[PDB]
């Protein structure tokens, strides 16, 4: 009685595979074969933020495109003003081992977490004048790899326990859980509408989740190893994934197929972070070879190289206005590029 | 307001100078073998923070990278271990840690524990590791077995050392355990500095 369900699964797989093969009109490289090549992108370092003692693991800008928070495993959360290079805030953390940090859209709250299996939310606008720990979200059975704010009262987190969670901050409870991944969820990217979000895990697959229903809409495969980074396209109809197989892959949602692959023979290191530009034609990706590559997302030809770090690049920082990029590294320095 | 920003920056920088001076005077150890468990101790006025990584799901290839810059990894192994070959599992874990590009400079303090268990056991180690029948010490049974395991670990370690890191094996009481961790960390720092001066 179990073989008929086995071949039920087989029929579903074959139907989906053939329906995907049917929507194979042409390759992205074909329709994009008559566009103007971007050319050599020559960016220079404009600011060098120093002050962190240990390697930096994550950074997030904030909707103002001026301030930015950075997390360093020396146990520090530093909020800098990128214009003047001054340190606006310095927050000591309970656990030294942090992996992610988030800036709230309102600028009033900051969030961090890591191997402590907890998401700490600190308040920045206090009549006391000192930053306090406003909340501590607990319930994950694995390390936190990424967290992102929806508003001042909701936050989405991804953990090493192969699960994602939506948290209400006031009550401190877990409203919705997202399961289905078979490996560590390493990254998550919120869509501009805040209704959907994609997540990449160590099982070499990405998943699209709807926030208001708690169910996986689509699954995307094609990478050969773990997915470390994932970023949404500005319009929200596609995304990009960086993996340990030394390639980046652009997937589409309405097509349900992989659209493009960015790779080179002389690149044999993994991708640690990805981010699009305001227009979305430049795909910036940090690598373990201490450099960052700027790909032409439409032509797949490497257009630029940012080489100013002496250690592993860990995070990328395109702003909301698209004026500058921020790169953090294991050398304990942050760099602003224009 | 720019003057206020400068004043806030000056205050934050004084605090950060204090924090930097306090951060360099501490040594972080990774114990291997609610998300993390800390243990702070002090030997000869030198402070040590050891971290036991529990509450994880036995897939280490991602969260291990967080310890790229610790002073040492304390690797605890049971000399004695439906009985599975756990010694080979420990050997494979040690080999994977020794050859990880993000840990190629970290020295490992090996602790061979449960020697009384192995002692009462010797009178089952040869069904695995068929080379035990020819190995010779460099009762005699427990010495043979423990030194054979130590030599297996050292054989794994001395194949890719590159001179940048070493292994410090001990047979195992917290007194001499802590004293040994202290002495091995001292030796690790000394060897790093000596290699930097083209002396080792």
């Amino acid at each position, epitope marked *: 009685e179990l073989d008929q369900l086995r071949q039920e699964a087989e029929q579903l797989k074959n139907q989906i595979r053939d329906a995907r093969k049917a929507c194979a009109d042409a390759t992205l490289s074909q329709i994009t074969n008559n566009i103007d090549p971007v050319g050599r992108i020559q960016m220079r370092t404009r600011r060098t933020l120093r002050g962190h003692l240990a390697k930096i693991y994550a950074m997030h800008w904030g909707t103002d495109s001026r301030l930015l928070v950075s997390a360093s495993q020396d146990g520090k959360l530093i909020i800098w003003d990128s214009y003047t290079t001054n340190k606006v805030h310095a927050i000591p953390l309970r656990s030294s081992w942090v992996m992610t940090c988030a800036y709230a859209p309102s600028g009033n709250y900051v969030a961090c977490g890591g191997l402590d299996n907890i998401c700490s939310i600190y308040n920045l606008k206090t009549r006391e004048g000192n930053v306090r720990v406003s909340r501590e979200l607990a319930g994950h059975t694995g390390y936190l790899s990424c967290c992102r704010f929806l508003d001042d009262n909701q936050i989405v987190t991804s953990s090493g326990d192969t699960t994602c969670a939506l948290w209400d901050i006031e009550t401190g409870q877990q409203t919705t859980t997202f399961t289905g991944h078979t490996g560590d969820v390493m990254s998550l990217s919120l869509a501009p509408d805040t209704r959907l979000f994609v997540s990449g895990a160590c099982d070499a697959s990405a998943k699209l989740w709807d926030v208001r229903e708690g169910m996986c809409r689509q699954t995307f*495969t094609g990478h050969e190893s*773990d997915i470390n980074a994932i970023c949404f396209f500005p319009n929200g109809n596609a995304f990009a994934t960086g993996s340990d*197989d030394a390639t980046c892959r652009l997937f589409d949602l309405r097509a349900d197929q992989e659209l493009m692959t960015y790779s080179h023979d002389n690149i044999i290191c993994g991708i640690t972070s990805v981010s699009f530009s305001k227009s979305g034609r430049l795909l910036l990706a940090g690598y373990d070879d201490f450099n960052c590559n700027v790909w032409d997302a439409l032509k797949a030809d490497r257009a630029g190289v940012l080489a100013g770090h002496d250690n592993r690049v860990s995070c990328l920082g395109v702003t909301d206005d698209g004026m500058a990029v921020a790169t953090g590294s294991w050398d304990s320095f942050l760099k602003i590029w224009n | 307001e720019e003057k206020g920003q400068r004043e806030a920056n000056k205050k934050i920088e004084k605090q950060l100078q204090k924090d930097k001076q306090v951060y360099r005077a501490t040594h972080r150890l990774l114990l291997l073998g609610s998300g993390i468990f800390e243990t702070k101790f002090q030997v000869d006025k030198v402070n040590f923070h050891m971290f036991d990584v529990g509450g994880q799901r036995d897939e*280490r290839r991602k969260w291990i990278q967080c310890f790229n810059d610790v002073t040492a990894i304390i690797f605890v192994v049971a000399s004695s271990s439906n009985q*599975t070959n756990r010694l080979q*599992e420990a050997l494979n874990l040690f080999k*994977s840690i020794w050859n990880n590009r993000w840990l190629r400079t970290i020295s490992v303090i090996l602790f061979l524990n449960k020697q009384d268990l192995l002692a009462e056991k010797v009178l089952k180690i040869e069904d695995y590791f068929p080379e035990f029948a020819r190995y010779t010490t460099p009762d005699p049974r427990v010495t043979r077995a423990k030194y054979f395991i130590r030599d297996e670990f050292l054989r794994i370690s001395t194949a890719s050392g590159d001179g940048r890191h070493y292994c410090y094996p001990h047979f195992t009481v917290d007194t001499e355990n802590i004293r040994r961790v202290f002495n091995d960390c001292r030796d690790i720092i000394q060897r790093m500095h000596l290699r930097q001066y083209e002396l080792l």
Partner: nanobody
Amino acid sequence: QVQLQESGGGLVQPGGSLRLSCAASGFTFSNYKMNWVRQAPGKGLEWVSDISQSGASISYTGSVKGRFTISRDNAKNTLYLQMNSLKPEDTAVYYCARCPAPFTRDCFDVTSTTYAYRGQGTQVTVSS
């Protein structure tokens, strides 16, 4: 999708011979280090053997040294385990595992009980 299909397992009297074949798909077979793992009744996953990218470096577990032979055919993207002089202690499910990342000497988590790059495995039973 990454797929590893094992085949060639069955029943065999003690002291017989078998040849397990693992067919890989969905990745560049040559850039990865391959492993054979096994799980016996009422036991955990135990690493058996491993072979490197080129096929020069080979490693076995002491329990099978002199009996098992690992082979890699990169033209056909196939792994082979030739077992000779099988004992009743080899009855188990054998899995064909791939290291997580390419171009690396370290192989993490191939026996994690939920590894993603491991196949379904084949049964082997040595008895009368």
